From a paper:
Type IA topoisomerases (TopoIAs) are present in all living organisms. They resolve DNA/RNA catenanes, knots and supercoils by breaking and rejoining single-stranded DNA/RNA segments and allowing the passage of another nucleic acid segment through the break. Topoisomerase III-β (TOP3B), the only RNA topoisomerase in metazoans, promotes R-loop disassembly and translation of mRNAs. We present a series of cryo-EM structures of human TOP3B with its cofactor TDRD3 during cleavage and rejoining of DNA or RNA, thus elucidating the roles of divalent metal ions and key enzyme residues in each step of the catalytic cycle.
Yet, RNA complexes of TopoIA have not been previously visualized. We obtained RNA pre-cleavage and rejoining complexes of TOP3B. We anticipated that exposing cTOP3B-K10M to elevated divalent cation concentrations, known to stimulate DNA and RNA rejoining, would arrest the mutant in a rejoining conformation. Using the same strategy, we obtained a DNA post-cleavage complex with wild-type cTOP3B, and generated DNA and RNA rejoining complexes with the rejoining-deficient mutant cTOP3B-K10M10 (detailed in the corresponding section). We observed a highly similar active-site conformation for both, implying a shared mechanism of TOP3B for DNA and RNA rejoining. In addition, the presence of MnS2+ ion in both the DNA and RNA rejoining complexes underscoring its crucial role in repositioning the protein domains and nucleic acid ends for rejoining. The presence of MnS2+ in the DNA and RNA rejoining complexes suggests its essential role in aligning the cleaved DNA ends for re-ligation. Therefore, the enhanced RNA rejoining activity may relate to the ribose 2'-OH group adjacent to the nucleophile 3'-OH making it more susceptible to deprotonation.
Author numbering:
A (entry chain B): 1 to 161
B (entry chain A): 0 to 611
The structure:
Amino acid sequence: MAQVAGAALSQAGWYLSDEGIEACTSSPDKVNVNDIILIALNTDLRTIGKKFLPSDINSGKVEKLEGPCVLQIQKIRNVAAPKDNEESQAAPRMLRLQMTDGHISCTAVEFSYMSKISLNTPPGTKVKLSGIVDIKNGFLLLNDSNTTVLGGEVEHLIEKW
Amino acid sequence: VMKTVLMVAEMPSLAQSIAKILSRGSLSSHKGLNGACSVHEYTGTFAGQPVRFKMTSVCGHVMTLDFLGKYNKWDKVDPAELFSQAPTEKKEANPKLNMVKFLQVEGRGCDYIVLWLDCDKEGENICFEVLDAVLPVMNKAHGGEKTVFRARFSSITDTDICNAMACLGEPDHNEALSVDARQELDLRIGCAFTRFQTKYFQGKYGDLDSSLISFGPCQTPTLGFCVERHDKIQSFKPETYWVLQAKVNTDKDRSLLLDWDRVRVFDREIAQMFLNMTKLEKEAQVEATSRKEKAKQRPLALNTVEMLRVASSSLGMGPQHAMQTAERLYTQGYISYPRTETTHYPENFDLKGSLRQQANHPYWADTVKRLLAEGINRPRKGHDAGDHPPITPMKSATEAELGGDAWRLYEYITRHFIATVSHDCKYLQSTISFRIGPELFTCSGKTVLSPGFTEVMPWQSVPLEESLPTCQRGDAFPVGEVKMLEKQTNPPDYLTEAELITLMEKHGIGTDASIPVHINNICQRNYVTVESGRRLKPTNLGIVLVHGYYKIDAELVLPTIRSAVEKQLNLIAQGKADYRQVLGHTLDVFKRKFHYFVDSIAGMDELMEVSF
RNA sequence: ACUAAA
Ligand SMILES: [Mn+2]
Ligand SMILES: [Mn+2]
């Protein structure tokens, strides 16, 4: 049985796709949600996960997003500094997160200074969004009050030198 | 029959100064042999007995290092043979002044010697050179008695000179050995390379038949700096960016230009979103008001690096021209010694007197007169690296006397002296923060309270601005117009002569007097060309050499190598190493460099072929 | 002819 697991994941904000992940970890007495999030945290949300975000986040039609949901970070860029030197003290730091649910890509913008997220964050970590978040011109508006980093590594290397 | 003591100074002007001091105005002056030198005779006390004093000067180095015999004709000696097989000897410098003969004839009957030379490495080297010159002719003296002396001085005031005569020391051999090793290394490594390059490139490419390609541990990195700047200029890709500006109208025709807190955003969509989330609103609120009193520091004492840097940036002068004009002013008697590293006035100095002589010049008569009534401010403590006191005026001058380019340098030096004994500028900084929609804006503004040293140095003045209106929290101001501004990142420009001097001193390349020479040498060899507002532009020949050096061996052009070899040579000076072991080891590491350079010289041929 | 430094 996995009804309790499904209810727990829905309440917690993880939106795993199907029973494929359930059959992935079929160890005896290993049907616990509290440690079933543990493996999914490192597992690729691109590979595993369902489609419940809207179809047209980037179209600009939508205004507000509700519910706590977990999403995966893909690329990090400091839009306040030139590409030649990523670090620059001439402008306050400002990040353009690229976020995904597994199928649909979205763009989020940092307003207030965040200590949990920086340039050196792993290109595959997960962030959980709580409460109602604002969408302006198709872009998410993230603040310190509605972000929770959850960590995790998806074996993506640095690929830079 | 009274005993005699002979004193040697490093330059005739200092000789005359120390003769006028310490003799209570009694001198007998003669000019012997060479016309530059002079002999000052007087009488006094020394070691407890009556004595006669003869004091003279030697103009710089007596002798310089050069190769011996045939190993100086370019066509009959292999350059690679210069490293170990070719012997060296200290022959002479400026042979038209028979300095050795003059010293020998002067020290014919002296019983003691006291060296009044500069307190530095070169001073110690010249000390031992003159010493070796004079001992073979001195009296045999006695047994366990000490005869050679050395005096340590940094200022030419009466009390300091008398104290320096009261307490005497001894020379050290390790510093002289260090500078000898430095001279020998810089001779061999650099003579061999220049000979090879000139003999090779002349015979293969015709456009450089009569030219000379030169290499060295002081001018090659200088060319490398400009080549690196050119590479950065030519390897730059501009980016486009958007900045959001707001105009706020407070009262009638009073408009304030607001500045965005986030100065720049490099994304079209992000800039559009911020514009769309601000343009609709027609109202503003003020959040924070600030009023902080701040100060602008007065300039330190003037050294030769600062003098050259300002002359090459504001006065439109070259380094060599500036130093030649400074030397002319010094020998005429209007400026104290124009080659110093010291930026700290001596504790016992006549600051009040030198400021008094300027009281009768119409340009700054009022400021000087006022400053003496309310007292002088203490000069800022800086760096006192022995040598000579900082560059300060000594006599009053009028534009009709000096005239031309000599006067413009005198004004800046004498304006620096008045500024360094004045008060700091006190300017009030005002900031008002706004909020037009979910964004934060700020405005700045400056008002002056006491000009201080701004009066004598107008170009370092706080700009005049209106006066940000006095507004408290909660005040409301309508907004006039908000719009974006598409701007592009500009590319830098070629290195200026002012910027290069900072880079030379930061990396330890060159001394206070070799900096003007090195800049001029790389200009003479057609490596760089001066253009526009004193900007050094690498010439097509210069680019190939530095680029070619990177492929072959990078640490022949890298700046950090010069500081590394100086560190090893400094170990000899402290006595913790041996002279030959350090010199021999450093020759060996560079000897294999020449062999790797000669057998792989084809690297630069590929780059030279396209450009000739 | 060269390097460097008074
Ligand atoms: Mn000197
Ligand atoms: Mn010096």
